[PDB]
């Protein structure tokens, strides 16, 4: 259900993952909180964050949750820990 | 039978122009005569002469044809009846045969014509395939 989904994709070893955190009751293939971007976060380049950065107000304030790697890359983006600064604001 | 004069009277006229009969009659009307007025202004014929009577009187016709005894009356048709009409709008209308066709005209928003609305984006009405 609910952690940052590093979602399987592609042809034979083309794991073009997608930024997602699946629903609290849906599977990896099912419906979701919301699909936020089209990139493989395990890309050989980097985490390579391209998301709906403006959506940090909705899913973080309701439901969403990272897991141990992208909470870092989100707040060097100014999202995840920075939403704690927003909550303090 | 004459929703269009091209419906039943053309049974007469299609031979009448083979025999150069360049004048005939028509039921009295205002839209029917209007469309033939468009066509004679385009130069199909000499002119739509006018009505003798009031109600379904004889509008005179005066059918010129091609100088080469040719006829570009390439069929024109309609289906009017209480039971068959268009309870339906040319707030947009397209054209066929690259604008060569010019034929029947009937709607209600603001006066243009079939060929006089080819460019408006509130078009007209075309049935025939002239070339």
């Amino acid at each position: 259900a609910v952690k940052i989904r590093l979602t399987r994709l592609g042809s034979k070893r083309n794991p073009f993952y997608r930024i997602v955190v699946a629903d609290a009751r849906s599977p990896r293939d099912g419906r979701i909180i919301e699909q936020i971007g089209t990139y493989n976060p395990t890309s050989a380049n980097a985490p390579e964050i391209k998301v709906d950065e403006a959506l940090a107000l909705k899913w973080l304030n309701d439901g969403a949750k990272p897991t141990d790697t992208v909470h870092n890359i989100l707040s060097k983006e100014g999202i995840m820990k920075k939403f704690d600064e927003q909550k303090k604001a | 039978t004459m929703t269009d004069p091209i419906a039943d009277m053309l049974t007469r006229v299609r031979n009448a122009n083979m025999v150069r009969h360049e004048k005939l009659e028509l039921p009295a009307s205002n839209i029917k005569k209007e469309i033939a007025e468009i066509l004679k202004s385009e130069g199909f014929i000499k002119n739509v002469e006018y009505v003798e009577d009031d109600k379904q009187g004889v509008l005179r016709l005066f059918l010129k044809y091609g100088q080469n005894d040719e006829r570009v009356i390439t069929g024109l048709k309609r289906i009017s009846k209480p039971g068959l009409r268009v309870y339906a709008k040319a707030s947009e209308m397209p054209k066929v045969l690259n604008g060569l066709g010019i034929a029947l005209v009937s709607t209600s928003e603001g006066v243009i014509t079939d060929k006089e609305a080819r460019k408006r984006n509130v078009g007209g009405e075309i049935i025939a395939y002239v070339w």
């Binding site: - | 130069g43 010129k64 395939y129």
Partner: protein, 156 residues
């Protein structure tokens, strides 16, 4: 000004006293490739001779096609009896656009821009009829627009 092309042949052999001849009754298109595709027929006999002995009869009357060059801009078709074809005009930059038997007569009149909706009956003699129907009933554009009282483009 007509068009050169071979159409077909036919070996007539009638129920007669002696051996049945096989006269190669042949139809041919002849000319020098202007646009006015003129075919004709002929009832001729010898294997190497009946081509020319039948083109003899073919050229007695070889028909005119008043050809709107480049392409007949609108849908161009025709019909007689059980014979007819159709041609939807397409882009001329498409190569050759044709049907099965009408391929070489598509090359005869220089348009090579319309397609050949190969319609009509299944009759071989009137296959020629179905072919020639499409392009025998033509009339040019500017002359018609002139004939209709208005200008060449007042009616456009």
């Amino acid at each position: 000004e007509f068009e050169e092309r071979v159409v077909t042949i036919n070996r007539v052999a009638k129920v007669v006293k002696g051996g049945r001849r096989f006269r190669f009754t042949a139809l041919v298109v002849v000319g020098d490739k202007n646009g006015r595709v003129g075919f004709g027929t002929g009832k001729a006999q010898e294997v190497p001779e009946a081509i020319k002995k039948a083109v003899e009869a073919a050229k007695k009357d070889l028909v005119v096609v008043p050809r709107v060059e480049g392409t007949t801009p609108h849908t161009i078709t025709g019909r007689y009896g059980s014979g007819s074809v159709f041609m939807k005009p397409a882009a001329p930059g498409t190569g050759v656009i044709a049907g099965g038997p009408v391929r070489a007569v598509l090359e005869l009149a220089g348009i090579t821009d319309i397609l050949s909706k190969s319609l009509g009956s299944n009759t071989p003699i009137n296959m020629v009829r179905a072919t020639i129907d499409g392009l025998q009933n033509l009339k040019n554009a500017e002359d018609v627009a002139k004939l209709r009282g208005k200008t060449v483009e007042e009616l456009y």
